Paper text:
CTX-M-15 (cefotaximase-Munich-15) is a class A extended-spectrum β-lactamase (ESBL) capable of hydrolyzing penicillins and cephalosporins, including third- and fourth-generation cephalosporins such as ceftazidime and cefepime, respectively. It is predominantly plasmid mediated, disseminated worldwide, and encountered in diverse Gram-negative pathogens, mostly Enterobacterales, but occasionally also in nonfermenters. CTX-M-15, like other class A SBLs, employs an acylation-deacylation mechanism to hydrolyze β-lactam antibiotics, utilizing four invariant residues: Ser70, Lys73, Ser130, and Glu166. In this study, ultrahigh-resolution X-ray crystal structures and mass spectrometry revealed the mechanism of PAS inhibition of CTX-M-15, an extended-spectrum β-lactamase (ESBL) globally disseminated among Enterobacterales.
To investigate the process of cross-link formation, we obtained structures from cocrystals of enmetazobactam and tazobactam with CTX-M-15E166Q, a conservative mutant in which Glu166 is replaced by an isosteric Gln, such that deacylation of the acylenzyme formed during β-lactam hydrolysis is impaired. Importantly, difference electron density maps from both the enmetazobactam and tazobactam cocrystals reveal the presence of a lysinoalanine cross-link between Ser70 and Lys73. Conversely, Gln166 is present in two conformations (occupancies, 0.57/0.43) in the CTX-M-15E166Q:tazobactam cocrystal but not in the cocrystal structure with enmetazobactam. Otherwise, the two active sites are similar, with both including dual conformations of Ser130 (occupancies, 0.62/0.38 and 0.60/0.40 for tazobactam and enmetazobactam cocrystal structures, respectively). The Ser70 -Lys73 cross-link is therefore present in all four cocrystal structures presented here, with a newly formed d-alanine at position 70 in each case.
Author numbering: 28 to 286
Amino acid sequence: ADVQQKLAELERQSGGRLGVALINTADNSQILYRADERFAMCXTSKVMAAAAVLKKSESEPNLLNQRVEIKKSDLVNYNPIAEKHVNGTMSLAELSAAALQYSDNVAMNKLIAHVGGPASVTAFARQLGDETFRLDRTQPTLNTAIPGDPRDTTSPRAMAQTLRNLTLGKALGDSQRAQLVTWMKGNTTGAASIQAGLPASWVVGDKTGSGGYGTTNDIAVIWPKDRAPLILVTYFTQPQPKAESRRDVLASAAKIVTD
Ligand SMILES: [Cl-]
Ligand code: NA
């Protein structure tokens, strides 16, 4: 009740729309706030794309070593890693790491294309038992985050459950699960988001997202000191098309639900 009041107060002060789902594996409990509403995933969808490639690799041993050409025509709006590799190749492992750890747009698009496109990523989610996730578009258009638009959305509840399956459950084989967790623990983009609301000693693997309407997102697997792990999804979006980022809102939500 108090956690619910605190999240409602945070949402009101922020001016936007906040979605939270925490799974605490200590006691199999959840803390939910707008957890069945849809939110634009933005960058957070790259976990599903990378997981689809990892799943494909379970029946294609050297898949992660497969080379992918990077060309000027592949560049999109945010290419921090791929821009360094234009006119050469990157492996699927390198693209997965760039997508997950730097939010590289080109890398996401190569993962999407490899597995057959947005509808194939969505079909993979369905195979896992996630009937909420939808990836409709590639980068950069999947980030538009227009209010009322269901494209490229999921709910906090569904994303938390799916992230739990991918990182702590059995969606992926042991090698592939460990690889996903290692990639997420090496993320470089999340220090101001969920991590900023947790004690410094806790270990986090996370994936952020951002987009139009000031959309600011983070999804995380969290190992608190000497405790069972948590899964936390914090999704946030705002009324104005050109609203600025609000990573502090995600940090505040994380602090509220883990205090
Ligand atoms: Cl505006
Ligand atoms: Na989206």
